[PDB]
Amino acid sequence: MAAQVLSGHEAAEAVYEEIRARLRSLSFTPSLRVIRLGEDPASVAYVRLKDKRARALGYRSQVEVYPEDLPEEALLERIAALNADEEVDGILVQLPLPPHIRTQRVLEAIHPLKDVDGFHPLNVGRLWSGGKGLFPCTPLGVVRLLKHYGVDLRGKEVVVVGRSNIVGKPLAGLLLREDATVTLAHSKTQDLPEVTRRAQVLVVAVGRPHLVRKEWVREGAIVVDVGVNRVEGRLLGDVHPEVAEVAFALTPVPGGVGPMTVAMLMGNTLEAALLRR
Amino acid sequence: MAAQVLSGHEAAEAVYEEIRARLRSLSFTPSLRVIRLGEDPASVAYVRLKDKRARALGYRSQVEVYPEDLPEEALLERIAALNADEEVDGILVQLPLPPHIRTQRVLEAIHPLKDVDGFHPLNVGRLWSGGKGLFPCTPLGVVRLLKHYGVDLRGKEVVVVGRSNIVGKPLAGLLLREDATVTLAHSKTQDLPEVTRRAQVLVVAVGRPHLVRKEWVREGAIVVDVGVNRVEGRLLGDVHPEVAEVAFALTPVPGGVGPMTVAMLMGNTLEAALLRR
Ligand SMILES: NC(=O)c1ccc[n+]([C@@H]2O[C@H](COP(=O)([O-])OP(=O)(O)OC[C@H]3O[C@@H](n4cnc5c(N)ncnc54)[C@H](OP(=O)(O)O)[C@@H]3O)[C@@H](O)[C@H]2O)c1
Ligand SMILES: NC(=O)c1ccc[n+]([C@@H]2O[C@H](COP(=O)([O-])OP(=O)(O)OC[C@H]3O[C@@H](n4cnc5c(N)ncnc54)[C@H](OP(=O)(O)O)[C@@H]3O)[C@@H](O)[C@H]2O)c1
């Protein structure tokens, strides 16, 4: 009766196995540059985990830490230098950027073929137009996770709660490519629980700890919890654990989506490399 | 009781009045180039209407007709010539292109600042990322039409049926910017009538004459009919006229969306001009 726990580590390992296999069939090794401004503790931990996993795979991985007060003109110069550096395959800027820096301007400076996070408007535009490109890592990880665990998304009623550029909107675009029926909900949706109750697959990316209660969830739903809420030294999802009483399967926090986000960044780094070479 | 008829001509006229006003406050006049390959009768009629209206506004408007068997290399050369022609503000390629021509390749050749149809992946990517750009004309026309007639889209349940790059997907993106809750449905949605029955605003762009029946429609819904189905020398929408019995307001065919599509192309032509100059 109780919900299965959709572990991200098991699904991420299948991605990592695919990556290791493809590397042997390659002359070179992919090279990832991660840029961080300042010392935000959540930012420090995230990049340390991206770097650690890239290196564990055998990538050339390098974190470039700058002071918080780096001028945006210096950031753009560095990115241009890395765009031209033919030995760098992937360029990643850790968000959030400090307020004196125009984030859109920085992201649009990254060359689209090195844009492993998929935020460049050319990659966004390729995603929604049906073409090839580098797409955002959490949405890729959510789609891959669902397909790993045997969900046939064709014809499924999917509700996505949250409409950010990092998760909800590229997620909605990727789910349409799997022929799902997609509802994008957000903070101005009225009677949100009634909207979510329709979902056979419910994906929540809002950043409110345990916001989603069991009355919001359809019996037998597949629930994917993207939230990562630091609360009392713990990590809390956006979905209340009581949802395991109603859902057929539920993503744990931590260890659900999070591992898949890292895995697909490693996969986007390979892809960016092969798209150039 | 019966549905109001949301005329596109009345809403289009408010756009045209805005355009005429802004032109007097301008030194120059916008210049539109429309390219057509072959002699498809629906294509001929569409471009003739875009040209006629651009000229009626006072634009420099020119249709370049080429043979159907024009090589795609010549098309791309012509577009590059027009991209560099500093006297051309808007470049438009009439679809469908003949099969020997890669449509994505042609559309991506148009400079984004002259891409009055909004298909270039940079304009698609700006739309979904929340930035500024030139967006597709029918979706713009649907949003503007609804706002013209007093629909407050914030918090509304909107269902969009059809997920093309020309209508459904840019429409979904534009509706999110108005804070609607958006459902994208399509040919693989199961129990489509039940999905559409939820919509307070229902937009249909599928190209099946009178497909949508009154049982599919929520009482008091606002129904926007994008279909244009040539049948028995008439023009039939995708929505059955019986829907006027249940809907609060319904877009006629012809004269509903169609006029708004033309108006927003004229508006995108102005915008492209001012974005350069
Ligand atoms: N595990 C991972 O790899 C990973 C990656 C990225 C983010 N995250 C987590 O996901 C969370 C969201 O961050 P984000 O950047 O994706 O999104 P975001 O832009 O920060 O906001 C999330 C969206 O959720 C909606 N929302 C917020 N509160 C709501 C409420 N009470 N009811 C209904 N809707 C509500 C908002 O809609 P409106 O726009 O309409 O206001 C907002 O756009 C964060 O806590 C972050 O830690 C995890
Ligand atoms: N008035 C205007 O300015 C204007 C402009 C453009 C188009 N149109 C009209 O709009 C119509 C659609 O053309 P388009 O290019 O926008 O779209 P399209 O790419 O040709 O197809 C429309 C979409 O509707 C869906 N669909 C088709 N039949 C369906 C059915 N029986 N049940 C549920 N969904 C169905 C399909 O979903 P799937 O992808 O899942 O198969 C398809 O993607 C055309 O007839 C065209 O004349 C009018």
Side-chain angles (χ1 to χ4, degrees):
Chain A
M1 201 148 278
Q4 323 181 11
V5 317
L6 306 120
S7 169
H9 289 114
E10 293 320 290
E13 198 56 43
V15 176
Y16 289 143
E17 228 42 56
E18 276 159 34
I19 289 170
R20 300 186 263 256
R22 184 84 181 79
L23 286 172
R24 312 174 179 114
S25 272
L26 282 184
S27 148
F28 71 105
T29 192
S31 172
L32 171 70
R33 286 302 162 86
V34 180
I35 296 172
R36 156 166 64 88
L37 270 69
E39 296 297 313
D40 169 46
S43 300
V44 173
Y46 270 145
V47 313
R48 177 189 294 169
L49 164 55
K50 304 171 178 210
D51 184 46
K52 169 165 177 206
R53 166 67 64 179
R55 283 162 126 139
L57 286 180
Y59 289 6
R60 312 178 276 167
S61 172
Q62 211 43 247
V63 179
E64 313 192 353
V65 182
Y66 297 90
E68 158 137 29
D69 69 358
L70 184 81
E72 98 169 8
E73 309 61 13
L75 243 192
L76 293 169
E77 202 187 318
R78 183 48 175 170
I79 292 159
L82 298 177
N83 282 336
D85 189 330
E86 259 182 10
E87 261 165 341
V88 170
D89 301 299
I91 301 169
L92 192 175
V93 187
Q94 179 62 48
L95 309 171
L97 281 165
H100 74 272
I101 288 202
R102 290 125 57 172
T103 297
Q104 151 175 23
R105 183 102 167 76
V106 163
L107 297 180
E108 294 196 0
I110 306 164
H111 192 271
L113 296 191
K114 298 178 183 200
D115 172 40
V116 289
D117 258 338
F119 295 153
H120 189 288
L122 166 58
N123 286 315
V124 183
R126 281 287 179 84
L127 193 163
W128 278 102
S129 295
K132 86 174 298 150
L134 299 167
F135 305 143
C137 297
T138 302
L140 284 166
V142 165
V143 174
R144 169 99 190 212
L145 182 146
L146 294 158
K147 288 171 115 172
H148 174 91
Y149 282 108
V151 190
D152 179 1
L153 293 166
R154 298 160 312 148
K156 288 284 188 306
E157 198 132 314
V158 181
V159 177
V160 178
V161 190
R163 57 167 165 178
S164 80
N165 288 328
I166 292 149
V167 182
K169 292 193 284 201
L171 185 49
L174 294 182
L175 292 163
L176 284 163
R177 292 188 180 204
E178 314 295 341
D179 290 343
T181 297
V182 176
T183 301
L184 264 167
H186 47 69
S187 79
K188 300 298 205 295
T189 304
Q190 29 203 38
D191 209 355
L192 217 213
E194 203 270 293
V195 174
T196 62
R197 264 191 298 271
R198 320 175 189 153
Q200 304 168 293
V201 180
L202 179 68
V203 190
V204 184
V206 300
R208 312 306 191 234
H210 297 185
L211 189 270
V212 174
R213 315 295 311 238
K214 49 165 152 78
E215 289 83 20
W216 307 31
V217 185
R218 185 165 166 180
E219 180 68 46
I222 312 272
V223 178
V224 177
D225 188 351
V226 188
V228 166
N229 306 281
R230 317 153 90 73
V231 161
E232 313 239 41
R234 298 210 117 216
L235 283 189
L236 261 53
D238 300 328
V239 179
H240 196 277
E242 74 185 3
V243 162
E245 298 170 39
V246 297
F248 171 85
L250 163 73
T251 279
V253 179
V257 169
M260 294 301 300
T261 301
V262 180
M264 310 301 302
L265 168 64
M266 301 307 145
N268 267 1
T269 297
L270 183 38
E271 278 284 328
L274 309 186
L275 260 46
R276 277 161 72 239
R277 333 156 197 227
Chain B
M1 201 148 278
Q4 323 181 11
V5 317
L6 306 120
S7 169
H9 289 114
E10 293 320 290
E13 198 56 43
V15 176
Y16 289 143
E17 228 42 56
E18 276 159 34
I19 289 170
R20 300 186 263 256
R22 184 84 181 79
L23 286 172
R24 312 174 179 114
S25 272
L26 282 184
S27 148
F28 71 105
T29 192
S31 172
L32 171 70
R33 286 302 162 86
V34 180
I35 296 172
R36 156 166 64 88
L37 270 69
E39 296 297 313
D40 169 46
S43 300
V44 173
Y46 270 145
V47 313
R48 177 189 294 169
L49 164 55
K50 304 171 178 210
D51 184 46
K52 169 165 177 206
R53 166 67 64 179
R55 283 162 126 139
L57 286 180
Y59 289 6
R60 312 178 276 167
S61 172
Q62 211 43 247
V63 179
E64 313 192 353
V65 182
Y66 297 90
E68 158 137 29
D69 69 358
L70 184 81
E72 98 169 8
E73 309 61 13
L75 243 192
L76 293 169
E77 202 187 318
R78 183 48 175 170
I79 292 159
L82 298 177
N83 282 336
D85 189 330
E86 259 182 10
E87 261 165 341
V88 170
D89 301 299
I91 301 169
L92 192 175
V93 187
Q94 179 62 48
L95 309 171
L97 281 165
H100 74 272
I101 288 202
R102 290 125 57 172
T103 297
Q104 151 175 23
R105 183 102 167 76
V106 163
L107 297 180
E108 294 196 0
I110 306 164
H111 192 271
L113 296 191
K114 298 178 183 200
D115 172 40
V116 289
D117 258 338
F119 295 153
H120 189 288
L122 166 58
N123 286 315
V124 183
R126 281 287 179 84
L127 193 163
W128 278 102
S129 295
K132 86 174 298 150
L134 299 167
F135 305 143
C137 297
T138 302
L140 284 166
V142 165
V143 174
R144 169 99 190 212
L145 182 146
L146 294 158
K147 288 171 115 172
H148 174 91
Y149 282 108
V151 190
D152 179 1
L153 293 166
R154 298 160 312 148
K156 288 284 188 306
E157 198 132 314
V158 181
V159 177
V160 178
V161 190
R163 57 167 165 178
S164 80
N165 288 328
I166 292 149
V167 182
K169 292 193 284 201
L171 185 49
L174 294 182
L175 292 163
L176 284 163
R177 292 188 180 204
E178 314 295 341
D179 290 343
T181 297
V182 176
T183 301
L184 264 167
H186 47 69
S187 79
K188 300 298 205 295
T189 304
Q190 29 203 38
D191 209 355
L192 217 213
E194 203 270 293
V195 174
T196 62
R197 264 191 298 271
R198 320 175 189 153
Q200 304 168 293
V201 180
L202 179 68
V203 190
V204 184
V206 300
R208 312 306 191 234
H210 297 185
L211 189 270
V212 174
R213 315 295 311 238
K214 49 165 152 78
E215 289 83 20
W216 307 31
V217 185
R218 185 165 166 180
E219 180 68 46
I222 312 272
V223 178
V224 177
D225 188 351
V226 188
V228 166
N229 306 281
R230 317 153 90 73
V231 161
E232 313 239 41
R234 298 210 117 216
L235 283 189
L236 261 53
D238 300 328
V239 179
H240 196 277
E242 74 185 3
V243 162
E245 298 170 39
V246 297
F248 171 85
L250 163 73
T251 279
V253 179
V257 169
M260 294 301 300
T261 301
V262 180
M264 310 301 302
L265 168 64
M266 301 307 145
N268 267 1
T269 297
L270 183 38
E271 278 284 328
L274 309 186
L275 260 46
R276 277 161 72 239
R277 333 156 197 227

